[PDB]
Amino acid sequence: PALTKSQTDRLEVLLNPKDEISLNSGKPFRELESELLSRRKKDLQQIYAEERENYLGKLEREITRFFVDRGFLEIKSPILIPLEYIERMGIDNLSKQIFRVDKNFCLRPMLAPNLANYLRKLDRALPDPIKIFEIGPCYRKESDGKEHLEEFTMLNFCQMGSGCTRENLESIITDFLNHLGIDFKIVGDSCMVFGDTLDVMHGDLELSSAVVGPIPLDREWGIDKPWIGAGFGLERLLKVKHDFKNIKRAARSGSYYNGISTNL
Amino acid sequence: PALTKSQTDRLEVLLNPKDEISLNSGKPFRELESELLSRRKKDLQQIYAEERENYLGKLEREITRFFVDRGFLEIKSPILIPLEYIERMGIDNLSKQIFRVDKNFCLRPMLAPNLANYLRKLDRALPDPIKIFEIGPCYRKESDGKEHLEEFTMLNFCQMGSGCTRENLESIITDFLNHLGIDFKIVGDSCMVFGDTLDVMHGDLELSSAVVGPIPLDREWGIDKPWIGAGFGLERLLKVKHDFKNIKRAARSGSYYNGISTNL
Ligand SMILES: Nc1ncnc2c1ncn2[C@@H]1O[C@H](COP(=O)(O)OP(=O)(O)OP(=O)(O)O)[C@@H](O)[C@H]1O
Ligand SMILES: Nc1ncnc2c1ncn2[C@@H]1O[C@H](COP(=O)(O)OP(=O)(O)OP(=O)(O)O)[C@@H](O)[C@H]1O
Ligand SMILES: N[C@@H](CCCCNC(=O)OCc1cccc(C2(C(F)(F)F)N=N2)c1)C(=O)O
Ligand SMILES: N[C@@H](CCCCNC(=O)OCc1cccc(C2(C(F)(F)F)N=N2)c1)C(=O)O
Ligand SMILES: [K+]
Ligand SMILES: [K+]
Ligand SMILES: [K+]
Ligand SMILES: [K+]
Ligand SMILES: [Mg+2]
Ligand SMILES: [Mg+2]
Ligand SMILES: [Mg+2]
Ligand SMILES: [Mg+2]
Ligand SMILES: [Mg+2]
Ligand SMILES: [Mg+2]
């Protein structure tokens, strides 16, 4: 017997990367589903008995320790931000990806503007160099695929003052991804907000865009020193680490817990 | 000389609870401001040199460890949720406090609906009792005062199955607030979504509303066992712990770092 599209979709929801199970072996849907339901219940029971930590929360904590231990100040800034920040970042009417809230506010699509404000303010009080980072939710309307979510989690680390060179930026990226055990390469790209970026790639998957300033946009933000920064998506890091086929396995979700279907 | 309203506001921004400084001692604004700027720069330099952790992030991590160690599964669910969830929770046209996003979605004003979904789903896979919790951003339009933010951080812990009694709920609340070192009392209140609540009070400040189910609303969420739950605002816990006069000191903000003005 042949499996319908609905049946294959249900098996794919229940399948995890570690399984070696052929969905098209000729065994009936009922037995494949029962086998995978049993495996997934066992997997969830093991998490509940022994770990209980959410992958996105746990990775945020691990990243936070890494940066705090390297001298970066942990930031938690607003997720709801002025729409004016979008304009001031050169996102001239990504502008179509912005979730608007009421009349003058939006959900932040990136962490950079709030971090630029912090760099400027902290430079009046703290010794050179200024090193800060933030992890938290960001939002973009996307044509949904296997690497994009509408609600995702960004890390951005940045530095202003001395030591803001391409080689230091690459060294921090390298130490960071070595800490996570993720192989990568650096390629040149370009984007509208920052211009040239160093994109951090795992295969064809973009883990990060990174920037060596100064750039002309700095004047609009009161930034007047050299700086470096990089933004990473946590769900993409999780996709690599766990070999997920689709990024939704990694997302904030009611449908998966640590990559395991919650429809059991 | 007398201080203007603008001058007093600036001094109040720079003043911290540990200071014993009279703003109305007759000393000129220039010297009071210079003294408090020096204290606040020193305080921020000490954080940067020795701790580097954000109060809201650090308290989320501490709470997460407390609940994970007590057998609760850590949840991270969507912040952008269907507007339909608002209706299904009996928030009939708090309904005025909802931030709408596009046409069918909103920013969650509480964690309860996503947690109700998780309790129902996990009960099909996990042993009794089901114990889960979430910490994260929630949003309400408020008439701004010293205890309300539009963007705040909720903890909700809940349990379904055995052990879902008033005395167990009170015992968890007690162990939790004892862990944080916060004195409290429990008073009866009532709200529209859940009916009678046990409100957890520190003086006149509401730290939490808590509920012993079942309640008639359960049927609309597929909940069909006894349950207990409580929601706490992290910024209110921080306000108590640090003796902040205004909750904005505790909030996600570009204007304060760990209660210290960033306008230095
Ligand atoms: N919609 C999304 N879902 C998940 N992660 C994202 C999304 N958009 C961006 N990111 C992550 O945030 C990082 C920094 O954001 P950036 O603006 O460079 O993304 P981007 O170049 O638009 O990504 P892409 O080209 O894949 O759309 C990205 O490298 C990626 O890891
Ligand atoms: N706007 C807000 N800002 C900060 N914390 C809040 C806010 N609204 C609710 N909380 C926190 O979330 C907890 C659970 O939410 P709940 O719906 O019980 O609040 P509430 O009863 O409306 O609070 P209040 O009566 O103070 O407005 C509250 O006890 C409080 O600690
Ligand atoms: N945000 C990217 C990822 C690369 C991150 C680079 N930005 C960053 O590191 O934050 C610090 C920052 C410092 C100094 C000036 C600026 C700035 C402004 F205004 F744009 F924020 N140029 N003036 C920003 C993405 O998601 O497209
Ligand atoms: N949310 C409160 C704080 C008190 C938290 C009580 N709720 C909670 O603990 O979550 C678990 C939950 C379990 C079982 C059913 C439900 C539910 C529904 F649909 F409302 F979610 N009643 N069916 C919820 C506030 O912020 O007003
Ligand atoms: K597989
Ligand atoms: K999501
Ligand atoms: K004081
Ligand atoms: K805020
Ligand atoms: Mg993109
Ligand atoms: Mg790109
Ligand atoms: Mg990019
Ligand atoms: Mg209220
Ligand atoms: Mg109340
Ligand atoms: Mg209440």
Side-chain angles (χ1 to χ4, degrees):
Chain A
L3 298 186
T4 63
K5 167 63 165 165
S6 177
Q7 286 171 332
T8 298
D9 281 349
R10 170 59 171 165
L11 298 183
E12 292 280 0
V13 163
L14 295 170
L15 190 71
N16 274 23
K18 299 321 135 178
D19 297 325
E20 292 145 344
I21 298 193
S22 166
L23 303 186
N24 311 291
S25 59
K27 271 176 59 78
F29 170 79
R30 62 183 180 279
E31 292 180 356
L32 292 164
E33 189 191 35
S34 176
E35 173 64 23
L36 292 174
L37 282 167
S38 286
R39 291 188 188 196
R40 298 299 85 82
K41 285 182 179 179
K42 169 187 162 296
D43 287 340
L44 262 194
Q45 287 155 14
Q46 199 279 152
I47 291 172
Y48 190 48
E50 303 301 336
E51 317 162 9
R52 292 179 300 283
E53 292 181 78
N54 175 267
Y55 277 174
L56 200 42
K58 185 170 71 174
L59 179 58
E60 169 177 339
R61 292 184 291 277
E62 176 185 6
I63 297 174
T64 296
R65 179 84 282 133
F66 179 89
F67 283 101
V68 163
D69 284 347
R70 280 153 187 79
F72 294 74
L73 185 69
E74 180 192 11
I75 304 297
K76 293 289 183 193
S77 71
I79 300 160
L80 199 46
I81 63 164
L83 204 59
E84 188 273 329
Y85 282 14
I86 304 307
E87 150 176 294
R88 194 141 49 87
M89 294 276 299
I91 306 183
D92 297 294
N93 312 40
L94 176 52
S95 188
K96 288 67 54 199
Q97 300 183 284
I98 303 299
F99 284 98
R100 173 86 142 269
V101 179
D102 87 83
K103 138 89 181 186
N104 293 322
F105 284 82
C106 64
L107 299 173
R108 66 190 179 184
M110 62 185 68
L111 301 178
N114 293 344
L115 298 175
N117 284 334
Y118 259 104
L119 288 177
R120 183 185 68 251
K121 292 180 184 293
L122 292 171
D123 200 39
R124 278 66 176 163
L126 292 184
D128 163 79
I130 310 294
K131 309 202 302 181
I132 72 177
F133 75 102
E134 181 166 0
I135 302 161
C138 290
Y139 294 85
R140 296 180 189 190
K141 297 177 186 172
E142 304 273 4
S143 315
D144 292 302
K146 301 176 303 313
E147 305 167 7
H148 287 89
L149 298 162
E150 302 215 305
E151 171 176 55
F152 66 99
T153 310
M154 189 80 85
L155 154 73
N156 184 132
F157 60 90
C158 54
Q159 180 165 323
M160 186 174 76
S162 61
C164 293
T165 62
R166 176 185 64 99
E167 65 263 25
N168 192 28
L169 176 56
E170 295 192 15
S171 81
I172 302 166
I173 294 170
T174 297
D175 290 352
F176 173 57
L177 291 177
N178 286 358
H179 183 78
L180 298 183
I182 298 173
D183 297 331
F184 72 101
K185 81 207 221 74
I186 291 180
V187 311
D189 214 322
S190 80
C191 81
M192 97 184 78
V193 175
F194 300 110
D196 292 340
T197 58
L198 302 179
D199 268 25
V200 179
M201 305 298 299
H202 180 85
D204 297 332
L205 182 68
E206 174 190 338
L207 301 182
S208 171
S209 284
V211 181
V212 182
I215 62 178
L217 184 67
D218 297 342
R219 185 178 180 268
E220 286 300 306
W221 292 82
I223 296 293
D224 53 7
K225 284 180 176 179
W227 66 267
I228 51 171
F232 281 80
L234 271 67
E235 292 86 0
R236 289 188 179 179
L237 296 174
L238 286 171
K239 183 180 196 299
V240 173
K241 182 185 181 180
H242 297 285
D243 302 296
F244 293 145
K245 286 185 188 168
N246 195 307
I247 195 168
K248 41 149 183 70
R249 295 268 175 148
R252 282 176 183 271
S253 174
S255 293
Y256 297 88
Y257 189 85
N258 289 8
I260 300 163
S261 176
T262 57
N263 291 114
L264 301 178
Chain B
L3 298 186
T4 63
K5 167 63 165 165
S6 177
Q7 286 171 332
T8 298
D9 281 349
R10 170 59 171 165
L11 298 183
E12 292 280 0
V13 163
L14 295 170
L15 190 71
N16 274 23
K18 299 321 135 178
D19 297 325
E20 292 145 344
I21 298 193
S22 166
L23 303 186
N24 311 291
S25 59
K27 271 176 59 78
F29 170 79
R30 62 183 180 279
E31 292 180 356
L32 292 164
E33 189 191 35
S34 176
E35 173 64 23
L36 292 174
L37 282 167
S38 286
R39 291 188 188 196
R40 298 299 85 82
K41 285 182 179 179
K42 169 187 162 296
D43 287 340
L44 262 194
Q45 287 155 14
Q46 199 279 152
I47 291 172
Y48 190 48
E50 303 301 336
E51 317 162 9
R52 292 179 300 283
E53 292 181 78
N54 175 267
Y55 277 174
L56 200 42
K58 185 170 71 174
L59 179 58
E60 169 177 339
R61 292 184 291 277
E62 176 185 6
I63 297 174
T64 296
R65 179 84 282 133
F66 179 89
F67 283 101
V68 163
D69 284 347
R70 280 153 187 79
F72 294 74
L73 185 69
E74 180 192 11
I75 304 297
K76 293 289 183 193
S77 71
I79 300 160
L80 199 46
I81 63 164
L83 204 59
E84 188 273 329
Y85 282 14
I86 304 307
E87 150 176 294
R88 194 141 49 87
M89 294 276 299
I91 306 183
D92 297 294
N93 312 40
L94 176 52
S95 188
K96 288 67 54 199
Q97 300 183 284
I98 303 299
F99 284 98
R100 173 86 142 269
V101 179
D102 87 83
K103 138 89 181 186
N104 293 322
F105 284 82
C106 64
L107 299 173
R108 66 190 179 184
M110 62 185 68
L111 301 178
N114 293 344
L115 298 175
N117 284 334
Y118 259 104
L119 288 177
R120 183 185 68 251
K121 292 180 184 293
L122 292 171
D123 200 39
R124 278 66 176 163
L126 292 184
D128 163 79
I130 310 294
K131 309 202 302 181
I132 72 177
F133 75 102
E134 181 166 0
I135 302 161
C138 290
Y139 294 85
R140 296 180 189 190
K141 297 177 186 172
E142 304 273 4
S143 315
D144 292 302
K146 301 176 303 313
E147 305 167 7
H148 287 89
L149 298 162
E150 302 215 305
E151 171 176 55
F152 66 99
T153 310
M154 189 80 85
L155 154 73
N156 184 132
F157 60 90
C158 54
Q159 180 165 323
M160 186 174 76
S162 61
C164 293
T165 62
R166 176 185 64 99
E167 65 263 25
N168 192 28
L169 176 56
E170 295 192 15
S171 81
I172 302 166
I173 294 170
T174 297
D175 290 352
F176 173 57
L177 291 177
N178 286 358
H179 183 78
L180 298 183
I182 298 173
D183 297 331
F184 72 101
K185 81 207 221 74
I186 291 180
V187 311
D189 214 322
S190 80
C191 81
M192 97 184 78
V193 175
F194 300 110
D196 292 340
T197 58
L198 302 179
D199 268 25
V200 179
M201 305 298 299
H202 180 85
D204 297 332
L205 182 68
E206 174 190 338
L207 301 182
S208 171
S209 284
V211 181
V212 182
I215 62 178
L217 184 67
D218 297 342
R219 185 178 180 268
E220 286 300 306
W221 292 82
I223 296 293
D224 53 7
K225 284 180 176 179
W227 66 267
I228 51 171
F232 281 80
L234 271 67
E235 292 86 0
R236 289 188 179 179
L237 296 174
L238 286 171
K239 183 180 196 299
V240 173
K241 182 185 181 180
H242 297 285
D243 302 296
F244 293 145
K245 286 185 188 168
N246 195 307
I247 195 168
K248 41 149 183 70
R249 295 268 175 148
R252 282 176 183 271
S253 174
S255 293
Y256 297 88
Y257 189 85
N258 289 8
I260 300 163
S261 176
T262 57
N263 291 114
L264 301 178

PDB file of all heavy atoms in Angstrom, chain A residues 77-80, chain B residues 149 151 251-253, ligand 8:
ATOM      1  N   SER A  77      16.651  44.739  26.101  1.00  0.00           N
ATOM      2  CA  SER A  77      16.036  45.987  25.653  1.00  0.00           C
ATOM      3  C   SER A  77      14.656  45.729  25.090  1.00  0.00           C
ATOM      4  O   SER A  77      14.224  44.568  24.996  1.00  0.00           O
ATOM      5  CB  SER A  77      16.942  46.612  24.577  1.00  0.00           C
ATOM      6  OG  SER A  77      16.911  45.872  23.356  1.00  0.00           O
ATOM      7  N   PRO A  78      13.890  46.758  24.783  1.00  0.00           N
ATOM      8  CA  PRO A  78      12.502  46.545  24.336  1.00  0.00           C
ATOM      9  C   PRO A  78      12.400  45.741  23.051  1.00  0.00           C
ATOM     10  O   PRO A  78      13.217  45.879  22.132  1.00  0.00           O
ATOM     11  CB  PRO A  78      11.960  47.976  24.147  1.00  0.00           C
ATOM     12  CG  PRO A  78      12.799  48.771  25.111  1.00  0.00           C
ATOM     13  CD  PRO A  78      14.162  48.206  24.964  1.00  0.00           C
ATOM     14  N   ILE A  79      11.387  44.870  23.011  1.00  0.00           N
ATOM     15  CA  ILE A  79      11.034  44.174  21.781  1.00  0.00           C
ATOM     16  C   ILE A  79      10.098  45.036  20.947  1.00  0.00           C
ATOM     17  O   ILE A  79      10.193  45.052  19.707  1.00  0.00           O
ATOM     18  CB  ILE A  79      10.391  42.815  22.125  1.00  0.00           C
ATOM     19  CG1 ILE A  79      11.413  41.990  22.911  1.00  0.00           C
ATOM     20  CG2 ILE A  79       9.909  42.106  20.856  1.00  0.00           C
ATOM     21  CD1 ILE A  79      10.799  40.812  23.747  1.00  0.00           C
ATOM     22  N   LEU A  80       9.214  45.818  21.575  1.00  0.00           N
ATOM     23  CA  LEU A  80       8.350  46.754  20.868  1.00  0.00           C
ATOM     24  C   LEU A  80       9.114  48.073  20.761  1.00  0.00           C
ATOM     25  O   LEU A  80       9.511  48.630  21.793  1.00  0.00           O
ATOM     26  CB  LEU A  80       7.082  46.938  21.727  1.00  0.00           C
ATOM     27  CG  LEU A  80       5.751  47.489  21.217  1.00  0.00           C
ATOM     28  CD1 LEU A  80       5.308  46.876  19.894  1.00  0.00           C
ATOM     29  CD2 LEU A  80       4.709  47.199  22.300  1.00  0.00           C
TER      30      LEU A  80
ATOM     31  N   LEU B 149       3.801  48.165  33.581  1.00  0.00           N
ATOM     32  CA  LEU B 149       4.526  48.387  32.341  1.00  0.00           C
ATOM     33  C   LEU B 149       3.704  47.887  31.171  1.00  0.00           C
ATOM     34  O   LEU B 149       2.908  46.944  31.306  1.00  0.00           O
ATOM     35  CB  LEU B 149       5.809  47.565  32.359  1.00  0.00           C
ATOM     36  CG  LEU B 149       6.798  47.892  33.451  1.00  0.00           C
ATOM     37  CD1 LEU B 149       7.812  46.739  33.639  1.00  0.00           C
ATOM     38  CD2 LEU B 149       7.568  49.209  33.143  1.00  0.00           C
ATOM     39  N   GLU B 151       5.239  46.508  28.553  1.00  0.00           N
ATOM     40  CA  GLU B 151       6.031  45.345  28.173  1.00  0.00           C
ATOM     41  C   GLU B 151       6.626  44.836  29.470  1.00  0.00           C
ATOM     42  O   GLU B 151       7.481  45.500  30.068  1.00  0.00           O
ATOM     43  CB  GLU B 151       7.120  45.779  27.175  1.00  0.00           C
ATOM     44  CG  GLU B 151       8.124  44.710  26.881  1.00  0.00           C
ATOM     45  CD  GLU B 151       9.113  45.133  25.852  1.00  0.00           C
ATOM     46  OE1 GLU B 151       9.760  46.186  26.037  1.00  0.00           O
ATOM     47  OE2 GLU B 151       9.218  44.466  24.805  1.00  0.00           O
ATOM     48  N   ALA B 251      12.461  47.452  34.119  1.00  0.00           N
ATOM     49  CA  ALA B 251      11.921  47.056  32.822  1.00  0.00           C
ATOM     50  C   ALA B 251      13.017  46.883  31.777  1.00  0.00           C
ATOM     51  O   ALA B 251      14.145  47.369  31.922  1.00  0.00           O
ATOM     52  CB  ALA B 251      10.918  48.091  32.355  1.00  0.00           C
ATOM     53  N   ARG B 252      12.662  46.203  30.698  1.00  0.00           N
ATOM     54  CA  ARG B 252      13.414  46.326  29.457  1.00  0.00           C
ATOM     55  C   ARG B 252      13.419  47.777  29.064  1.00  0.00           C
ATOM     56  O   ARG B 252      12.373  48.429  29.019  1.00  0.00           O
ATOM     57  CB  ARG B 252      12.700  45.531  28.333  1.00  0.00           C
ATOM     58  CG  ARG B 252      12.921  44.063  28.412  1.00  0.00           C
ATOM     59  CD  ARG B 252      12.103  43.370  27.317  1.00  0.00           C
ATOM     60  NE  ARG B 252      12.264  41.942  27.428  1.00  0.00           N
ATOM     61  CZ  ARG B 252      13.213  41.219  26.832  1.00  0.00           C
ATOM     62  NH1 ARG B 252      14.052  41.823  26.012  1.00  0.00           N
ATOM     63  NH2 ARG B 252      13.277  39.923  27.039  1.00  0.00           N
ATOM     64  N   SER B 253      14.600  48.279  28.744  1.00  0.00           N
ATOM     65  CA  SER B 253      14.689  49.720  28.702  1.00  0.00           C
ATOM     66  C   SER B 253      16.004  50.066  28.043  1.00  0.00           C
ATOM     67  O   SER B 253      16.977  49.307  28.145  1.00  0.00           O
ATOM     68  CB  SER B 253      14.693  50.249  30.141  1.00  0.00           C
ATOM     69  OG  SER B 253      14.919  51.631  30.175  1.00  0.00           O
TER      70      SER B 253
HETATM   71  K     K C   8      10.014  48.195  27.756  1.00  0.00           K
END
